[PDB]
Design a protein around this ligand. Sequence first.
Ligand SMILES: O=c1ccn([C@@H]2O[C@H](COP(=O)(O)O)[C@@H](O)[C@H]2O)c(=O)[nH]1
Ligand SMILES: O=c1ccn([C@@H]2O[C@H](COP(=O)(O)O)[C@@H](O)[C@H]2O)c(=O)[nH]1
Ligand SMILES: O=c1ccn([C@@H]2O[C@H](COP(=O)(O)O)[C@@H](O)[C@H]2O)c(=O)[nH]1
Ligand SMILES: O=c1ccn([C@@H]2O[C@H](COP(=O)(O)O)[C@@H](O)[C@H]2O)c(=O)[nH]1
Ligand SMILES: O=c1ccn([C@@H]2O[C@H](COP(=O)(O)O)[C@@H](O)[C@H]2O)c(=O)[nH]1
Ligand SMILES: O=c1ccn([C@@H]2O[C@H](COP(=O)(O)O)[C@@H](O)[C@H]2O)c(=O)[nH]1
Ligand SMILES: [Cl-]
Ligand SMILES: [Cl-]
Lengths: 447, 445, 447, 445
Amino acid sequence: TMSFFDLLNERAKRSLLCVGLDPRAKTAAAAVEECKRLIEQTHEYAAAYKPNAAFFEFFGAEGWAALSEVIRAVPAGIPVVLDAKRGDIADTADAYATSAFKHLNAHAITASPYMGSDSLQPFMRYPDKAVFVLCKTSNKGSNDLQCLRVGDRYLYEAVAERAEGPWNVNGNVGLVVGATDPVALARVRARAPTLWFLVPGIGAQGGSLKASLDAGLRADGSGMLINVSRGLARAADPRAAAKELCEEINAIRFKGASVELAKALVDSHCVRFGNFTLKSGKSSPIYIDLRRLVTYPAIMRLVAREYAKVLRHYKFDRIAGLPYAALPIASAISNEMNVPLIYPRREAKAAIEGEYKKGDRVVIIDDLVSTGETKVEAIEKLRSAGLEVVSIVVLVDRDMGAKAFLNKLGYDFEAVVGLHQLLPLWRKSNAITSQQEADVRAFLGQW
Amino acid sequence: TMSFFDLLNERAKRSLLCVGLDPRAKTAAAAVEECKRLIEQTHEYAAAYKPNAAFFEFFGAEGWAALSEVIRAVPAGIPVVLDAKRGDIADTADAYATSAFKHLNAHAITASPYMGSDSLQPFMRYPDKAVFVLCKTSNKGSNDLQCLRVGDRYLYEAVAERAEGPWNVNGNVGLVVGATDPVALARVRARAPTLWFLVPGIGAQGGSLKASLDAGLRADGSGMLINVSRGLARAADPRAAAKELCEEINAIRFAKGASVELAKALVDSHCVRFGNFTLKSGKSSPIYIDLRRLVTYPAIMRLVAREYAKVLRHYKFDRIAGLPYAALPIASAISNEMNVPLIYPRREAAIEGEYKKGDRVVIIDDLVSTETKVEAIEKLRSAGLEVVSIVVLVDRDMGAKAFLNKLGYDFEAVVGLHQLLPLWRKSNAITSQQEADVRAFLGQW
Amino acid sequence: TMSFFDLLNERAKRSLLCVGLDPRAKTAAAAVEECKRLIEQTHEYAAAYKPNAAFFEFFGAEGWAALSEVIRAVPAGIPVVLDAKRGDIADTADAYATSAFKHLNAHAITASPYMGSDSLQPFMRYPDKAVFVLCKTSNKGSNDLQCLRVGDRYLYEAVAERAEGPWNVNGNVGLVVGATDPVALARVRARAPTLWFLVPGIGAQGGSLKASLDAGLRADGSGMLINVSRGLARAADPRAAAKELCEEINAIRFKGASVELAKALVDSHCVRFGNFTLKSGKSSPIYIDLRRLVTYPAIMRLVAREYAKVLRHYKFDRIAGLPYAALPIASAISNEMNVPLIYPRREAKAAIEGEYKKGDRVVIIDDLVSTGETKVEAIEKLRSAGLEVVSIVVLVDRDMGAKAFLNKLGYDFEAVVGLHQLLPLWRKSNAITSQQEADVRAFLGQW
Amino acid sequence: TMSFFDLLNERAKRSLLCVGLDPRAKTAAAAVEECKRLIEQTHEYAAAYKPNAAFFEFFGAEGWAALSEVIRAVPAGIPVVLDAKRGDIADTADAYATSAFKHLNAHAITASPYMGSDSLQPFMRYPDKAVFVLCKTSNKGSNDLQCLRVGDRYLYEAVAERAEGPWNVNGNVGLVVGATDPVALARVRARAPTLWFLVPGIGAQGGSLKASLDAGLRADGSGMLINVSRGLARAADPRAAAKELCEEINAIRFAKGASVELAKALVDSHCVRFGNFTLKSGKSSPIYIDLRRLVTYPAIMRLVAREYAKVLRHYKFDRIAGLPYAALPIASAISNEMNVPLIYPRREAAIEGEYKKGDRVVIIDDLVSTETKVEAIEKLRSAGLEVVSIVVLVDRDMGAKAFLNKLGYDFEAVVGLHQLLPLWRKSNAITSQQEADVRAFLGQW
Ligand SMILES: O=c1ccn([C@@H]2O[C@H](COP(=O)(O)O)[C@@H](O)[C@H]2O)c(=O)[nH]1
Ligand SMILES: O=c1ccn([C@@H]2O[C@H](COP(=O)(O)O)[C@@H](O)[C@H]2O)c(=O)[nH]1
Ligand SMILES: O=c1ccn([C@@H]2O[C@H](COP(=O)(O)O)[C@@H](O)[C@H]2O)c(=O)[nH]1
Ligand SMILES: O=c1ccn([C@@H]2O[C@H](COP(=O)(O)O)[C@@H](O)[C@H]2O)c(=O)[nH]1
Ligand SMILES: O=c1ccn([C@@H]2O[C@H](COP(=O)(O)O)[C@@H](O)[C@H]2O)c(=O)[nH]1
Ligand SMILES: O=c1ccn([C@@H]2O[C@H](COP(=O)(O)O)[C@@H](O)[C@H]2O)c(=O)[nH]1
Ligand SMILES: [Cl-]
Ligand SMILES: [Cl-]
């Protein structure tokens, strides 16, 4: 089995956009049509899909068979949140729970806090499924009841507290916080700093796409499903609209600055252009030589500083820098962090310099990755000598499908910046010519 | 076209029983059959039917057509409460309100208060339909959130306030208050004296029928829908178990005479006290009755009003008149419970309040002995108001009724002094010596 | 002696606007002139004044003598916050503390958290003076350092926590939170729900006058000094600008709704017009008869509900309703709250009905107040029988100077709504004619 | 027109003493006199003067004209650090920056980092002036906020990072790091290898002079302003106490030879180990030196670099060349500390790094015995690079210096094997038997 948050965190590495499936059509058949078409258009950029029962229940009996088809018409990788807003006495709630998880095969459900936790356990007892409790709602008359003071704090805050504490027995509980109220959104994140937030209101209702995000995002730069329903269904080109939102969201979250790094690579003469031939016979118009970094200790300290931001998220004992290029970089990083360095002697009863135990956790540091052929030689030489490779961290990801290769190889990977990300900056800084940019852009389409 | 309450008040003349339709069946077809059977057996004694959507929704596509079938199997005149607990943003809520009222043809719906008034407006705008907002729910986990304090009152008490106030624009807002908590029932009834409650908890959840009614009923003796679902579906004979409940509920509503809790309260409240008092009649008395101090015990003051209302229920009048000072706050308490306008003459121990000439009033006083009631009872009759009756809490059994009838004035008391004797022997409010002395004191008349 | 918060809470009952005195003038003499003129214009509506040392220190020696004159040119009732942003080692900080409190006679100072609490004690040790520590600053580059994560929360939050806990030894500490960042403002209020906030940024810097207030106001609807400096000094009519802000702030805080109450009074035929003569010989065009409320139990329950909002802020044992008009109202209130009622028999060995002990705390409930002549008869009859009068609460304050009379008499007072407040609503609702409004408005100018 | 650092580096050739001017005087006139007296006595040995505004601000109007007078009483060439700790919004900050630089004519100012870079920009835009940002302050309450963790490093360490990085646009950003905490001094020096520190805490606050310098000084032996204020104002003879400090500071900066902490680290780090090793010379040895494993101890690796830099200080070169593998990370550590570009030949046990023909390089290796150094030392000389010297950490005292001089190559070591003997006897890093065997092993040459 796999839980909702397993599936969701996977898509959260890519996007946070949740597609609201709210039919509104001539008939029940028409309703299915619109949705099917809305699924196929958006699925690449969609973190989640959210059918709201109301618009399906509108069509009566034909509407229920309609909801079930639309739910199965979702590719097996985008979690489906049923917006049903259930909440009744345990025994009645049970029937609602089986209907949503066993009959409709939804991965998550919306619910009301009002009837207490014993009304929510019937839904929360499913460890694989998620429950998003209503906290602060997007509607203007939410403050009518939710903004009442329960001594020191508002009611929704009291809800938030309970949602993270007494109720989150097995890490299932999410909260519904509305985008039209950024101030309330921020307060719930202060009360539930860990939880996931289902956030509607963007498009038809209000906005504050940025203000919302600055308010309720976690330390990880994740934990907000931004839901747009009517806004995409009334849109002209849903695929473009979906992409635009996905990107607009991703541009606000995260990198971090990347602008000063871009300069550093150019001030170090690392970026060079021509007809270079890599270890593949195939020629690239651009070559990045981070071996030059050695002649600029100040830039090298900056580079090491960028690596640290990535490496602050992994638990490890030692650093394994791969000579030549990476070894000075790895030395610099080692200095910023105060973590022991290790390095494989470039050859074919250890061939490994430094000091390692057996089964201590290392992170492989390399300069850049194009494909991953080099990254394998190293993982095999290191797991050889009895070391657990945590990940590989790199300054520049050349964007030749290096992540996916390594993932399917087993060990995961992360890069500080991508080649595609650096291009717009260099052009802006006049470091790269118009022809140089489009040449590189064209080269990356092959992959 | 004909309102949910129009229908209900008419059925409520004979029954307050709400037959619940939560079918636990093998298939959706069996569910309809199970419900059909249950409707045919019980309808003569049912005030309303309440199908809970969950159980029909269990069977998906066929299940929904089953819900529609069960609703249309209800005889015209019996209203149908759809228990669906709706609540979302206004735009979404419309689809829920249409579905319930226009497609399914339900007469009312249950709903959550959490999303505020604008979320309930799409339901409440249908004037002919009704909305029961969740207030204090039957489950024990109600205490977990509804019992948080919002200043001086509970959260559900604040929900009660909005329901009976800002939200009841179209006069069609009721409340779901569980039978398992009678303290809650009193407190919601205190905040909402006129609203209908939908009351679940009898049977499967083991609520108390007597305790719920006494705490929960309106002034008019008929503002509660007692819902029973599994208690009837599990019964070997639904028609007889519906009859037994319908009767039991009725005998409690229409019961005439004062309660043990009233009789006890009075002694605790010290409105009736024992001492060695000597009267203007020169003869001494072991007991004195002072309802002046009733103003310090607001909960007792509610009880008193409810007890006055029981009597006042059988009269026809436009307004109530309270006599200052002792009976002004008492009258005000009644005036709240019944929702009838009040009136008072000044300079007692002009007339404020709106009154027209020929209005029918009932005069409220605290006590009647023998002498001072007949004097102020006429400063009102002078203004052209019609005294229907003089109603009092305690009659000292000193020939007031007789004396006032001779003067052509109608009279009635809630409890007589003799009647209190067994009522507070039933709760040990009074000792046997204390009984003997009161009994012997009365023997002189 | 009197503390800063004593003086400030006094003005906070009226306004929250803080006037920034930031000279910017030809000479030091010119600087004094501008400020003197800016003081006289704004003082009625000003909660606080804030000279920022920089603009005075600009003028050197003549600038220091200038600062001191401007500080004394502030009427003895508006607290003066020196924006100096001090913070050094204890021994050096001492000199700065004496310079601000003993030499310049400022009531409060701004300071930096950076050097720890031992650098702030030299300022906090003055129990009469206040200290506003920098938390989240209004400048765009505030996030550069303040928005760093100290595990789970931001740096300014860590500051906020310390400001309310370890540092607030004698209730002196305030926080400087900027108006241009409403989201950060809300988070600091979640970390310091009790503290006072000095809030600049409105006018020249940004805005969000409302968004700011919805974020950082306490449960009491107070605890934010909104500071405008350059915005008022560049303004054409400072007195009008000051009033406009003061009102715009006060209209957002608080009443509460008041709109449904207005209707209720009209639906109850309580508001009547003519040539009425009150217990004073002087004639009023308007008479409000709340004795009619008795014929509308539903409205009476609403009226009682309004009184409760006021009465939720006082600690008391019993309620003393004054017959006739107030006794039914008091009965209704008694019912909403479950508090024992007491009433003085309308006459001249108690003459008081109910049940009271000796020295239990009562609140006098009356219908409306015009002057206060009646409110005295009652306070004297009640303190006679051995009762501590907490306050008097009223539905309608007729606005004939009733508050000030009673205050100077000793017992304080509060009203649910003022006559001036009800007028605009009734006109909007068409309940009052144009001539009726202007007649009443004209009548209230006498007072 | 002439930069604060231009002035300082020139004074720093003879002194690192900063004379502080915090007058505790009866009147403002006495303050000027007190300060004047203090300037005249100390200027010959003062690198900078630092008046703290607080004490001048104490006397209000006259006090400010006193500050201006004291500043203008400083001889031209000696720079003046105004300790005012400024920081507000940019628009306000301008008035503070003008006041300091243009009115008062100070050459640098101290400032808080709390308000971010845009708040410091109004100061930092004056290229000729300098800004000392508060980093780790002298007071014990520094630990209270500056020592909070921001991921993996302290808050002050993050301040250090920004100061030496994003903020030092005009090359005029220094740091205030207190003398009372040498651990902090090392850690800030680690993050900012090139920045000047303003160092308070000597005297009144009882900082350690030796501990502060060793931890705090740059590679060039001259990147610290040692501030003393009350320690000199209270002194009976300022001129002599300034001289005593100026000398003491200098003897520590210019001290030649390896440290006890270096010698000890090596043994702990296990770079020098004792066993029963047998060499290629066939004769056995009780000690072996391997600096390959230096990569696991980054703090030691810093020490090593600082020690290399002490030697390299007296040479003239453009770049440093590191020999892989043992000496590549070592060279990189030096390259960081000194801020000089590095170079390395490949295929060791082409040349990467930018180099032009005729560049002057210093070759860095870990160790020298006798044989393999002379071979790769020429793959560089071949590329047209000029080998100024071959510098090494440990000399085994086996006639390397002599042998290399014969080949016309300049050579130097940080510590010799003989020299280590008393250095780690001074910390018990080695036993007397362990000394005897090493001593006897050397006697063979
Ligand atoms: O607090 C909430 C919870 C859920 N939704 C649901 O999210 C969708 C709003 O998206 P849109 O159509 O306004 O863009 C609707 O289906 C609505 O029912 C809200 O808008 N606010
Ligand atoms: O533009 C490039 C392409 C490749 N490499 C070298 O290629 C090796 C990584 O190859 P791989 O991980 O893609 O197989 C890196 O260590 C790097 O030194 C570069 O330096 N620049
Ligand atoms: O606060 C409430 C609201 C609704 N119900 C409904 O009552 C019906 C069950 O009644 P019974 O099984 O106790 O007879 C169920 O549909 C349940 O949802 C409650 O019990 N308590
Ligand atoms: O975080 C802060 C702290 C203080 N101030 C001060 O408040 C005033 C800003 O008002 P204004 O001129 O921008 O309207 C200035 O004196 C400024 O120094 C800020 O703007 N932001
Ligand atoms: O327009 C008015 C003016 C006065 N009063 C009566 O005046 C008394 C209060 O007078 P005082 O408190 O201003 O002296 C109140 O109890 C109230 O009953 C009114 O009812 N309506
Ligand atoms: O982190 C700091 C920053 C500045 N000072 C300044 O040092 C001067 C006092 O030096 P002394 O009395 O210890 O010699 C004072 O002006 C004080 O403000 C410190 O001691 N520590
Ligand atoms: Cl390489
Ligand atoms: Cl009156």
